[PDB]
Design a protein around this ligand. Structure first.
Ligand SMILES: [Zn+2]
Lengths: 99, 718, 637, 49, 99, 49, 49, 68, 198, 49
């Protein structure tokens, strides 16, 4: 029915109609929030990976300046706890809301 | 003229004399301060928003409103139906300012179907086939607008013509609603600042006020809060309320150029020197509260040095509580009592607060108040008031003057607030301890106490199973551990259902049918399973109760039965979002805390209900005198005798079903429930009350039990 | 009219006399109510000389359509005789209490004279079952309300408090780690809520008109509570008393509401609800609990989701109610020899549905299920609002929620608070009062949707998950599998029918049946549903009775003399008696009585009804009567 | 039910409830008056079905 | 590849002057051929043996009518809809995710 | 009617239908006085009930 | 409030009387059906099905 | 009236032991008061469970990766 | 905005502005992937996306769906009234406007934007029963609609499903070969949902 | 198995495969130690083939 019953006003200029309709959308900075959140996402992700790796032995390819210090437990449980700590820290520092 | 857009918070007081006070009452402290602000926020706009709220999305509504100038100079001029409207241009020929032909006018008068022709070609005519924004666009022009419908937004809506044309075309209440707009305008003034509920384009001279509290859920524009906040956030346009007090505005705390050390900043110095002989000798529904930041510290080290300590935020503690206790900022009071418990006033502050969080972040914490934590706090200092505003209390958590039940987990400090607080005054009637119902009362009623019986049944099980259950309950990570705990739960459920329910159901009048009852329970289920018509409020306190009851050792159980009972009740309780118990406490005790601040004495009242002597004598009672007996159901307090008498002529549409036994145990029941909001907000009620004869000497002998019905009537007393 | 032997009538006389001799004639009759059907209907062909002819009914492939075909007859033989144990022992044991064992002996001996299924056998069954008392029992409404709503379900494994997330203002979502029937229930309602969420079928102005119009009827209640609550909040409602129409009518209150902005009325939903009672013939009196128009409007999402669950899962199990006769072939097919059927029904679904276990789960699922959708989209005049989200202890905040969710927020609040009824019985003297209860209103067909949905859900989980994991008999597992509700189970409100797949030329061992039925009882006990099941190779559904594909009219449920009256006064005028006669006669046709004698009795009834009169409160009298030809036109031969 | 009966003026043989009983139950809310009234009302109602 | 979107139908840039129904779009072609095929089916021998020709004459008639309706949808799909998608892709909280 | 016609489109539809109907029924001279079911009479039915 | 059995009876009666299509349109529009669906419904009316 | 001077010493209810610091008193309550095997269920093992729970309490952490 | 709403800035000194509002594609790519990780990969994830986009589409569009001209062009066809079957009624009984203003059409369009996450399929019920013959008119009309609406869906298997839909009706007069064993020309067409069964 | 089910089943299996578990490590590196010591103290020595 849709593809067989489509119709519009007689003397329609698409450019004017679309422009008049799209005007309210691009009216504020709100269209740029995702950029900022993405940036924080990146920094949070890298730091988390770095922290988890440093507690491991030669994990990934990160520098290990603190390697002189002892770290006996390397179980996955410890890694999860570390990652949660970092995740909470960033959420607190930058006052994030979503997951 | 810098503008500050304001979105009201959760319990924003609206009927206040000045909208300004509900924002932050410190702004009213100094004449030098209050003279710098305008308010606007007119009522007509408020009503329009109330209506359109159900018909526009947040984005649309914001997009529509944002362009409106501060003082709305335009009006919406409703036109009557063409048959009616056409006559106007001939009733006054000069009123035909569009000069519509006389022939057309009387052709309309003749036609069975008067057309829109009279509207046609009239400039700026808005037909019903129009949209909200069409009005708003014209509003920016300032000129009045002519419309053909009442549902319009942005400008005050008034009749274009005298009411005679609109009559019949519209009805009484409709014809009434436009009257203020018919003579709408009022001036707006050019002070330094102007607050506004109307949104606007955020910019260099427009700011968003941040109060750090949840919005008014009922307020129609609260949905705009996220979009507004984020836009302000991304441009650093938020203003903490304290910034308003400074001579020059800046977003920030602890600025360099100002020490912020002045009497204006100190919210604890609440003062009321002025007067106007107004009927509100006091409005006991409006309550000033504060959000405070307090620093906690432990014992110093071996060399007199001390740790950095931690600072927490306490939310919405009533200010009069602190003032009456002579609490002052910048003073390091001792926190711990001789026995190590908290000093009473701190406990009161916690109990009546709404929430406690870390100062910086937004994480809520339940504070411990026992010997659990190492390096425990011993000193406390209040540092500053993050916010200080008046809040509306009338009927908020509880609804009926009859009674209300508050549910709290076992181990709460209810004893402190119900005993120490009234004892701290013990001079003005607050409540009667015979009317408050301890949650443990029914458990104590059984000849072997419910706890003893539960213990006696429980010991029949193997000790190891019990040991496993207790450990599982304490250990948070012990998910379920079905075997041990479930067995105990079955015994608990079986016993409670067996004995507690009938015993509870046997105390129905004691819970509700007294003067005014305040009751505690361990779970809403305790009442629902017994069908007791009393409102139940699921409260919570911002302190860890588990550790607290772990310190109470003098009990029937060795601190292990207690935690078991605690878990059982919590399991028994229905899953729902619980509210802060402080709000209920604020509703009950809050108004009383403002009594000492008053300047003039109180005046007592009551709503005694009559009792014909016939039924009393017929019931074997020996009574002197013919006049019908009367009984005081509930006493109230005011201070302006004039308006109080002026408000005493209302006839409450709630009958009383009085019942009294031969033992003089007297009970009352209101067939239509008496709601608190029906009480005029200038009144003041005791927390609890007990019904009693107004003149016990009238009776000479109690016959049998008696019941009767009568009306209710507020009256003075001497 | 039924033309029964005097011996059976003799037993009924002794039955009534024994009941009348003791105190509380009504109570005594009520206790030993089911004796007659158990003695006769539940145990007929438990012998050796079994045989006869039986219908051969086939259920067409698209079973959802409930289409059946008569396809011949089947010879009866011993291998097809009923398998369930007889009912003689329990009934006789009960009768010993009232020393009426002679009645049982007489009935049993007479029954043993019909070893083969034919007209005589069923005719005997019809007659004996027609012996139960046909009195409309009535008791004090105060006692009735106090005895029925004083019950709370007993849950054998409550949902632990740690199984919920942080609050969303009022509701709590269910943690993913939780399994079991509750998880099944949660997912089902959530899925339905999702489907409801995006649906341009609503917001169609015509459909909106249907819903609002559906709320108004000539009857109604709770108007006084409405006027008080709104007057309490400062709302000055209009009045139209001069227009002579009852205030308590749902129409009247609806007219008062028309102008007001809806959100202003939100405080009024937490108001008292009046109640009424309708007596019954063979059970406790029913309850009528009419909500006010506003409350009925708020509960809309609950109804809508329930409807979708019904219409799109098991096709509402006939709750479309298009013509009630669709259940007739169903039970006939269900009672045929090749099929084994089990009758089930919730003990008190109205009293067992509750917030602590059930409604909380549903509210959470619906609120979560509505998350998929525009957060700012008003529904039925209810705008979106801001609510605080506390799922994350580290990152709490507030976000908008759609109008549907706002409705749920209030609806959950109301359910948690429990319904607050106000009783004002007139038969008792000066004793009106109010008390709350968790009992669901369930005053009309609007409740059948919710209970039927939950009924179907729990049954489905039991069949597919709980039973296979728990039952022991390997043969039972083999037959229990390959079975699903859409082609093995139907229900309406509490009532339900379960039929087994055709055991290959055989019947399931009663041992396995006992194992199966036992496990079902325990399964219902888990979440506090007493299932009240039975197995007697008969069909009870919506008060219809079928035996071996033959319908049995339970005439006792339509007593010739009895009629319900729920008020101290009859409050009716003489001409109405005619319509009573017409309705009375039709029942005697619907139920198959001796058509010649029934007609004779009917005319006599008509003759008496044909005449009547009236007197002015002070003045004149009036009189009239009809010519007999009227009744011919009204439908009496 | 007998003891709770008066006599009718139209048909002297049959009776109805005492006006005294219903008055006292209504006005005085007397227990025994109320109990008698309630019993009479429901007993009559059961017969009316 | 970034800043590109795939599209099941052929597409064109936005028209310049006023729009009008057309008959050379892909969708219109698909419609016409489909109708033409079914008309051929209806006239096949299989139908003739069982279907009264009068009804057959009617059925081919109504199918013919559908093929001649001057619907606007096919033009909109080819020329205007892609623009709407391209704009809205920058507005939704979740960017498009295609394969 | 206000409760029934919350919006305006329905009211416009019914009014147009009623106006056209009576115009057709009289002009075409089918008959006059035909009580045709229409929404405008639904409130009337409610009031009578 | 309205009766379906009245509506279809009127529609069939109109169809038998051979009323012009706009008559059906007015009747359908009189019960809230929009013009497009009104035409759609009116077309379905036939003595065959 | 509200106190304005800290206690000179802190007191336990039954042991009559006076402590110069509340921390020392807290430990005494945390440890010495809590063996008391005298009831139907006051087993030593639950005392250990209670003792462990007491020591493990911390409700004012900003980060809490354990419970997150 | 596809160069619509063209705008420009003034030309003057702007000393101390700072607008940290941007990020690289890698950031966006990373965030998009992260977003896909924090969802339940069932329909619950896709539905809000499609719903939001569809609402936006319907919000701004010049196209208006109106079947009045189609029906007007259909009902004007003359036919005998003495026959027992009127195919016009059969057609108009189908194409029933459910009053939802054809949400399916906008739903299909929105699905394209997220075809890599969710696919739209033709409903199983909207198929001709495999037991019918081509002469069963309702079956024939159904097959016609499936053929017309085929391309609008994102399901890769839709063409085969369309082809088999007709093949079911012609299994009697016109047989063809089906590759995989266990499948026959009368198999329900909706089951052909595997690339290996073409 | 339609396509939707096919992916659904696939997602379940791969999820089962991906989740971490220490059980295999315990079997290969820790369980033998526990068995060895326990066998040395149980009253009934192990009986094996
Ligand atoms: Zn000690």
């Amino acid at each position: 029915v849709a593809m067989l019953c489509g119709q519009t006003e007689t003397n329609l200029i698409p450019s004017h109609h679309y422009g008049k309709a799209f005007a309210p959308l691009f009216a504020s900075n709100a269209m740029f929030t995702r950029n900022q959140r993405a940036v924080i996402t990146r920094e949070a992700f890298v730091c988390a990976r770095s922290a988890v790796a440093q507690c491991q032995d030669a994990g990934f390819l990160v520098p290990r300046p603190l390697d002189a210090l002892r770290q006996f437990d390397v179980t996955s449980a410890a890694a999860a706890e570390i990652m949660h700590a970092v995740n909470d820290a960033f959420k607190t520092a930058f006052d994030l809301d979503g997951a | 003229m810098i503008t500050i857009v304001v979105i009201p918070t959760a319990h924003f007081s609206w009927t206040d004399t000045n909208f300004l006070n509900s924002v932050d009452y410190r702004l009213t402290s100094q004449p030098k301060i209050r003279d710098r602000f305008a308010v606007y926020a007119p009522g007509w706009l408020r009503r329009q928003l109330d209506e359109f709220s159900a018909s526009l999305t947040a984005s649309e509504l914001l997009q529509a409103l944002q362009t409106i100038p501060i003082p709305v100079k335009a009006r919406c001029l409703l036109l009557p139906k063409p048959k009616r409207f056409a006559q106007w241009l001939l009733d006054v020929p000069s009123a035909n300012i569009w000069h519509i032909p006389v022939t057309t006018l009387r052709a309309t008068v003749a036609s069975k179907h008067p057309s829109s022709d009279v509207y046609n070609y009239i400039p700026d005519h808005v037909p019903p086939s129009a949209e909200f924004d069409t009005v708003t666009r014209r509003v920016a022009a300032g000129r009045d607008i002519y419309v053909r419908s009442t549902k319009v937004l942005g400008a005050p809506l008034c009749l274009a013509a005298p009411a005679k044309y609109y009559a019949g075309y519209l009805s009484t209440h409709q014809l009434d609603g436009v009257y203020p707009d018919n003579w709408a305008p009022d001036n707006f003034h050019k002070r330094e600042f102007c607050l506004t509920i109307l949104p606007s384009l955020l910019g260099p001279r427009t700011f968003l006020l941040d109060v750090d509290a949840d919005r008014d859920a009922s307020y129609p524009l609260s949905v705009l809060w996220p979009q507004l906040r984020v836009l302000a956030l991304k441009s650093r346009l938020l203003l903490p309320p304290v910034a308003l007090l400074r001579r020059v505005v800046d977003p920030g705390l602890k600025p360099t150029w100002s020490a912020d050390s002045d009497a204006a900043f100190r919210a604890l110095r609440l003062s009321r020197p002025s007067s106007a002989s107004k009927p509100t000798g006091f409005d006991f529904s409006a309550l000033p509260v504060v959000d405070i930041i307090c620093l906690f510290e432990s014992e110093p080290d071996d060399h007199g040095r001390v740790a950095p300590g931690t600072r927490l935020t306490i939310h919405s503690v009533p200010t009069d509580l602190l003032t009456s206790l002579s609490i002052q900022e910048g003073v390091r009071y001792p926190l711990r009592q001789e026995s190590g418990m908290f000093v009473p006033w701190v406990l009161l502050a916690l109990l009546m607060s709404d929430d406690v969080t870390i100062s910086g972040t937004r994480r809520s914490v339940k504070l411990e108040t026992a010997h659990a934590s190492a390096r425990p706090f011993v000193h406390i200092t209040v540092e500053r008031c993050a916010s200080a505003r008046v809040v509306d209390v009338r009927g908020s958590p509880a609804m009926y003057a009859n009674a209300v039940c508050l549910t709290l987990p076992k181990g709460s400090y209810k004893s402190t607030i119900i005993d120490t607080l009234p004892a701290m005054f013990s001079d003005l009637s607050i409540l009667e301890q015979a009317a408050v119902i301890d949650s443990d009362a029914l458990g104590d009623s059984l000849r072997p106490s419910f706890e003893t019986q539960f213990l006696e049944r429980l010991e029949n099980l193997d000790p190891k199973l019990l040991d496993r259950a207790v450990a599982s309950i304490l250990s948070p990570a012990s998910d379920t551990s079905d075997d041990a705990v479930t067995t105990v739960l079955d015994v608990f459920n079986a016993l409670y259902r067996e004995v507690m329910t009938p015993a509870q159901r046997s105390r129905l009048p004691l819970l509700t049918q007294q003067g005014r009852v305040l009751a505690f329970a361990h779970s809403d289920y305790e009442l629902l399973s017994a069908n007791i018509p009393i409102q139940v409020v699921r409260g919570s306190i911002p302190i860890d109760h588990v550790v607290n009851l772990l310190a109470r050792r003098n009990r029937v159980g060795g601190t292990a039965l207690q935690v078991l009972l605690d878990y059982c009740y919590r399991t028994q309780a229905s899953p729902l979002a619980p509210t802060p118990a402080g709000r209920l406490y604020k509703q009950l005790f809050g108004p009383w805390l403002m009594v000492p601040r008053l300047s003039d004495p109180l005046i007592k009242l009551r709503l005694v209900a009559s009792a014909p002597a016939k039924v009393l004598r017929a019931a074997g009672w020996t009574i002197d005198g013919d006049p019908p007996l009367e009984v005081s159901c509930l006493c109230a307090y005011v201070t302006d005798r004039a308006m109080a008498a002026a408000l005493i002529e209302r006839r409450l549409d709630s009958r009383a079903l009085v019942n009294v036994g031969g033992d003089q145990l007297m009970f009352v029941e209101y067939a239509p429930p008496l709601p608190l909001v029906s009480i005029p907000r200038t009144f003041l009620l005791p927390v609890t009350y007990v019904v009693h004869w107004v003149s016990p000497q009238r009776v000479l002998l109690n016959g049998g039990n008696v019941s009767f019905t009568s009306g209710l009537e507020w009256t003075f007393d001497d | 009219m039924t033309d029964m032997s005097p011996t059976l009538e003799l037993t009924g006389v002794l039955m009534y006399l024994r009941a009348a001799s003791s105190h509380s004639h009504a109570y005594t009759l009520l206790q030993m109510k089911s004796v007659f059907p158990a003695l006769s209907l539940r145990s007929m062909y438990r012998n050796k000389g079994f045989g006869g002819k039986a219908p051969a009914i086939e259920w067409t492939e698209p079973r959802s359509k409930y289409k059946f075909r008569w396809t011949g007859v089947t010879q009866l033989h011993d291998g097809l005789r009923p398998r369930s144990p007889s009912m003689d022992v329990p009934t006789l044991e009960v009768l010993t209490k009232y020393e009426l064992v002679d009645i049982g002996h007489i009935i049993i001996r007479e029954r043993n004279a019909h070893p083969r299924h034919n007209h005589d056998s069923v005719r005997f069954v019809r007659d004996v079952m027609a012996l139960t008392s046909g009195m409309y029992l009535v008791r004090q409404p105060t006692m009735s309300v106090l005895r029925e709503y004083s019950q709370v379900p007993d849950i054998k494994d409550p949902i632990p408090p740690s199984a919920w997330t942080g609050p969303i203002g009022n509701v709590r979502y269910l943690l993913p780690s939780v399994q079991g029937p509750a998880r099944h229930l949660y997912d089902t309602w959530r899925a339905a809520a999702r489907q409801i969420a995006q649906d341009p079928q609503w917001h169609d102005p015509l459909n909106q008109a249907i819903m609002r119009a559906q709320y108004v009827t000539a009857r109604g209640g709770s108007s006084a509570s409405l006027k008080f609550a709104l007057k309490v909040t400062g709302i000055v409602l209009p009045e139209y008393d001069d227009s002579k129409v009852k205030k308590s009518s749902k129409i009247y209150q609806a007219a008062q509401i028309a102008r007001i902005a809806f959100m202003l009325l939100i405080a009024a939903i937490h108001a008292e609800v009046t109640m009424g009672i309708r007596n019954q013939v063979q059970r406790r009196a029913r309850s009528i609990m009419p909500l006010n128009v506003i409350q009925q409007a708020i509960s809309a999402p609950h109804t809508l989701v329930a409807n979708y669950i019904n219409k799109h899962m098991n096709l509402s199990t006939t709750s479309g109610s298009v013509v009630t006769d669709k259940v007739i072939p169903l039970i006939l097919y269900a009672s045929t020899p090749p099929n084994t059927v089990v009758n089930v029904d919730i003990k008190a679904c109205d009293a067992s549905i509750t917030y602590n276990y059930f409604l909380s789960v549903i509210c959470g699922a619906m609120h979560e299920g509505f998350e998929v959708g525009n957060a700012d989209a008003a529904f039925m005049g209810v705008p979106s609002t801001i609510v605080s989200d506390r799922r994350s202890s580290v990152a709490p905040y507030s976000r908008p929620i759609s109008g549907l969710q706002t409705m749920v927020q209030h609806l959950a609040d109301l359910y948690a608070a429990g319904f607050r009824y106000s009783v004002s019985d007139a038969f008792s003297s000066g004793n009106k009062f109010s008390f709350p209860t968790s009992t669901f209103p369930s005053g009309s067909t609007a409740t059948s949707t919710e209970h039927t949905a939950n009924n179907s859900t729990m049954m489905e989980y039991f069949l597919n998950v709980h039973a296979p994991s728990h039952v022991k008999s390997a043969s039972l597992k083999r037959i229990l599998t390959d079975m699903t509700i859409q082609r093995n189970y139907v229900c309406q409100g509490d009532d339900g029918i379960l039929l087994l797949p055709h055991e290959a030329a055989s019947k399931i061992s009663a041992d396995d049946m006992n194992e199966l039925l036992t496990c079902l009882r325990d399964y219902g006990q888990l979440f506090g549903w007493n299932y009240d099941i039975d197995w007697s190779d008969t069909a009870e559904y919506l008060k219809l009775y079928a035996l071996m594909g033959c319908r049995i009219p339970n005439t006792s449920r339509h007593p010739p003399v009895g009629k319900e009256y729920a008020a101290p006064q009859t409050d009716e005028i003489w001409p109405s008696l005619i319509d009573i006669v017409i309705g009375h006669h039709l029942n005697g046709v619907t139920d198959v009585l001796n058509w010649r004698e029934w007609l004779r009795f009917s005319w006599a009834f008509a003759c008496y009804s044909s005449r009547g009169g009236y007197t002015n409160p002070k003045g004149q009298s009036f009189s009239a009567q009809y010519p007999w030809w009227t009744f011919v036109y009204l439908g009496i031969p | 039910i007998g003891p709770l009966l008066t006599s009718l003026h139209t048909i002297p043989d049959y009776g109805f409830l005492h006006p005294a009983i219903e008055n006292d139950a209504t006005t005085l809310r007397a227990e025994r008056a109320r109990c008698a009234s309630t019993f009479y009302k429901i007993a009559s109602s059961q017969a009316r079905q | 590849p970034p800043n590109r979107m795939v599209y099941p139908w052929p597409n064109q840039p936005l028209p310049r002057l006023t729009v009008a129904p057309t008959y050379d779009s892909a969708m219109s072609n698909w419609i016409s051929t489909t109708i033409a095929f079914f008309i051929r089916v209806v006239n096949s021998v299989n139908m003739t043996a069982t279907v009264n020709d009068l009804t057959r004459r009617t059925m081919t008639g109504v199918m013919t009518a559908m093929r001649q309706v001057k619907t606007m949808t096919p033009f909109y799909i080819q020329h205007m809809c892609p623009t709407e998608l391209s704009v809205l892709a920058s507005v939704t909280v979740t960017p498009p995710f295609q394969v | 009617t206000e409760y029934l016609f919350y919006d305006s489109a329905l009211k416009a539809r019914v009014m147009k239908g009623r106006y056209n109907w009576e115009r057709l029924s009289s002009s075409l001279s089918l008959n006059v006085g035909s009580r045709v079911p229409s929404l405008f009479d639904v409130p009337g039915k409610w009031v009578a009930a | 409030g309205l009766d379906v059995e009245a509506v279809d009876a009127t529609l069939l009666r109109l169809k038998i009387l051979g009323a012009p299509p706009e008559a059906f349109i007015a009747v359908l529009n009189g019960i809230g059906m929009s013009d497009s669906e009104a035409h759609q419904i009116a077309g379905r009316i036939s003595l065959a099905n | 009236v509200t106190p304005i001077v800290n206690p000179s010493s802190y007191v336990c209810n039954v042991c009559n032991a006076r402590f110069s610091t509340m921390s020392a008193l807290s430990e005494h309550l945390r440890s010495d008061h809590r063996d008391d095997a005298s009831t139907l269920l006051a087993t030593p093992m639950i005392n250990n469970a209670i003792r462990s729970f007491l020591t493990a309490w911390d409700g004012i952490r900003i980060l809490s990766p354990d419970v997150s | 905005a596809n160069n619509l709403l063209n705008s420009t800035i003034p030309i003057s000194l702007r000393p101390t502005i700072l607008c940290p509002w941007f990020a690289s594609s890698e950031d966006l790519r990373l965030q998009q992937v992260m977003h896909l990780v924090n969802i339940s990969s069932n329909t619950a994830a896709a539905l809000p996306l499609v719903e939001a986009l569809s609402t936006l589409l319907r919000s701004v569009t010049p196209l208006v769906l109106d079947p009045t001209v189609l029906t007007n062009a259909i009902t004007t066809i003359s036919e005998s009234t003495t026959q027992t079957i009127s195919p016009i009624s059969e057609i108009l009984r189908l194409l029933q406007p459910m009053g939802n203003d054809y949400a399916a059409f906008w739903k299909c369009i929105a699905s394209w934007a997220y075809n890599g996450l969710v696919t739209t399929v033709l409903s199983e019920d909207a198929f001709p029963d495999s037991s019918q013959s081509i002469t069963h008119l309702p079956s024939m009309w159904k097959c016609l609609f499936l053929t017309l609406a085929g391309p609008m869906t994102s399901d890769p298997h839709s063409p085969v499903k369309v082809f088999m839909a007709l093949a079911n009706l012609l299994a009697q007069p016109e047989p063809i070969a089906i590759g995989v064993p266990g499948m026959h020309q009368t198999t329900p067409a909706s089951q052909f949902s595997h690339p290996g069964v073409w």
